[PDB]
Symmetry: C3
Subunit: 334 residues, 3 copies
């Protein structure tokens, strides 16, 4: 108990897929990380004709990435603004006790709460809202879930215990939504989250999502929201899915070092084509880009990637290596 | 072949989630463990307005937990009472040959059979009914599946080969069920399994369970059936799912050592938030309770946890530790 | 870059579940393995009353297994005959760049393409067609996916790095299909893939397959297509599923060494009852048969195994071992 002598670092969170500033290898001993976030409830557009009455941490789906190191403390201030219409809370799978923080952070619109917990376990972990009861799933599939990554104090290590570093970390937040359709087969729009609850419950109960998206919308990470790398970059892709499985794959690439259950002191596997993110967790994969051009990072049920929304692109620069792959003879008539 | 010289230990099974008396470190060489079970067909109540025409081992869903040590033998007398209507048999995934024992145990109402098999392989394994052909999935989703845990002779070891011990083991048997609905949307009830076979088959073919439950029924392991520990107990959660995947998570806690594919000579992973039970298997996770309070053990597709029934609670005694977690500022007005 | 000095090996692919000739341990240094495949579009029969306007590599579902060794090159001539009706390409999850080769092998009916890539990573790997867009899932669930196994040069090793060898390798390609039904409830048949496109899209969007099959059809690996072994054979089962997860289980056996994410420089697990093939990948499992008789190799959601089609059988000859299992009392009246 105590802590008056640990340093405090106050952070400014940035919207996903980017991450707030940090260091892989901790620059000093345990600190108290201070974070603040508000619940913003608002309608979001998931696709060209599909909308969700969302509930979100800081206005974005997923909520922003938090990064700290193992042995640190996390003190979060959570605000539920007076214009929201429901109570929210927050459960950190990285924390120990009271339902992850969920039993000490229930706040009604108009209130705030400050939770502290010590980040004893290294890994990426989901956090998400869980107000109690029959509503808990409904708040997660309305968008309130993000991730906090607890890095080991000395940074990541590989399956032999040797240090490894990434040049860039992107947080891909995947989320399943259950938008109801009226009779003519078109998506329904509602005036706030409650009005749409009962119709959304009926679709939830079939367990088939109408949309599975990265970063909050079909296309959020393609086009202008494409991810970027260079040949030689070691990139860390952190991938959460708070309520339903996912099987990520980098098309054209591999997972060089993968922790698919997400906890960095376990040995990562090598050379994977596809890995698996259990619903309710965050895993992480490093890949060093060896060829330039366009890559798609997708949930490899391709129906879920292409029809429901779970595809991102990565644009990579650099020179092409024909010894890895060559079009020996371009398409030509038989 | 032979065996007349090994000792014989006759056990009395107990209802899940508890386990019959046993020891973690084999208190001698190989013994033949004698068990006896009946099949009981009966209607059971899954939820406030949902029932299933069940077929069960011993009266319960899941069937009771058997516990033996690697290299023992298992001699089970299975009885099919005259009052059942259908043939039943049992397939032990822990056993080698004749379809897990299903090919040597098919018995009609009024008959018994006695199968012996050597438990050559350590881990938690599913056993379930498998009468033959198209009826295998229907018997399983009507309730006939349980678990046998074959412990290594010298007890469990962590990922460094060091001995770890649990103070308590709980058997969580998870089961998906496909209860059909009539035109008004309410669940149907039948006079026997046959009569609801056709209707059931149609919900089976959609692959969407109506109910996914621990211990045979919505709330079976909450309220009076909540699981209990104290701070400092090391608890072993053995989790089966004989027909569909699950992704267990202890909310407020973690898997300190987890064998999600359930076979103890594999190394276990540490610090998991959520782990993954493949349909058709049992896994097992050890956690040492650090904080007191209520914890929910759930299947973390939270629609399945809370709409379909896959939630258990644990009430744990003891003293709170504010250094792991603290409500620094209780909910207050902005 | 270069290669004019490496030996070139020309292979003759065979229909799954068999494999073309190959040595487990490479008998020479890196070679260029040349393979040729045509796309064949044809209506195939998936079950007594269900058909699929299929698109296939070389006329089988799965496409045929390719075996090479780590550090070899692979140079495939892919051919899209003039009678076909759509463009096709190929994406090898074994390869690095240009979307697995799919950005270099897009060919219209009446064309061929020659793609060479270096098989840098050891493991079994899915390959599949992915022409671009919205169509990608639809070509893969119309059948165009097989597997390449890139064996370490020194063949397979156990969990401690020691040599293990298989006497037989079978390739079990599992594929999910989404055959639409008309109002009377019967499956529809169509004149070519295009015509049945929009109907098939609407079943695909439920994410519920109508059929889940091994080797292209229900019962394809049963009866006359059953797999065969004798007691003491070590049989390697390579299992691919390009678009959806599967949980294979050998009923009456176990996985003795399983790489469920399929990459052989990761250590295998042992004694599994059921393992997990993530959609978008292939895994593999070694088992030494110990008992003679019929075994079922299944996808252990039993609905998927029996209702939907994912059951194959294995007929094993040899002497029965009573010490592993014995019917001590045959069914008798109480
Ligand atoms: Cu909320
Ligand atoms: Cu949670
Ligand atoms: Cu039965
Ligand atoms: Cu089974
Ligand atoms: Cu194609
Ligand atoms: Cu792919």
């Amino acid at each position: 108990v105590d802590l008056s002598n640990l340093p405090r670092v106050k952070h400014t969170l940035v919207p996903p897929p980017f991450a707030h500033a940090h260091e892989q290898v901790a620059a000093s001993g345990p600190v108290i990380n201070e974070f603040e976030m508000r619940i913003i409830e608002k309608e979001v557009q998931l696709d060209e004709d599909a909308y969700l009455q969302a509930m979100t941490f800081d206005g974005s789906i997923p909520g922003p990435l938090m990064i700290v190191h193992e042995g640190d403390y996390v003190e979060l201030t959570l605000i539920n603004p007076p214009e929201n219409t429901m109570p929210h809370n927050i459960d950190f799978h990285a924390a120990t006790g009271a339902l992850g923080g969920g039993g000490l952070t229930l706040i009604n619109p108009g209130e705030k709460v400050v939770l502290r917990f010590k980040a004893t376990r290294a890994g990426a972990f989901v956090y998400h809202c869980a107000p109690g009861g029959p509503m808990i799933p409904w708040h997660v599939v309305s968008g309130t879930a993000g991730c906090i990554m607890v890095l080991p104090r000395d940074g990541l290590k590989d399956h032999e215990g040797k240090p490894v570093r990434y040049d860039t970390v992107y947080y891909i937040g995947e989320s399943d939504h259950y938008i109801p359709k009226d009779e003519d087969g078109t998506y329904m729009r509602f005036s706030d989250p409650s009005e749409g609850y009962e119709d959304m419950v009926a679709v939830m109960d079939t367990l088939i999502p109408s949309h599975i998206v990265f970063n909050g919308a079909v296309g959020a990470l393609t086009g202008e929201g494409a991810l970027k790398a260079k040949v030689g970059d070691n990139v860390l892709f952190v991938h959460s899915q708070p309520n339903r499985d996912s099987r990520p794959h980098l098309i054209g690439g591999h997972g060089d070092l993968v922790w698919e259950t997400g906890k960095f002191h376990n040995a990562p596997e090598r050379d994977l084509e596809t890995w698996f993110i259990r619903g309710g967790t965050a895993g992480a994969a490093l890949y060093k880009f060896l060829q330039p051009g366009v890559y798609a990072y997708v949930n490899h049920n391709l129906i879920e990637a292409v029809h429901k929304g779970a595809t991102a692109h990565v644009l990579v620069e650099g020179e092409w290596d024909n010894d890895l792959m060559e079009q020996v003879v371009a398409p030509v008539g038989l």
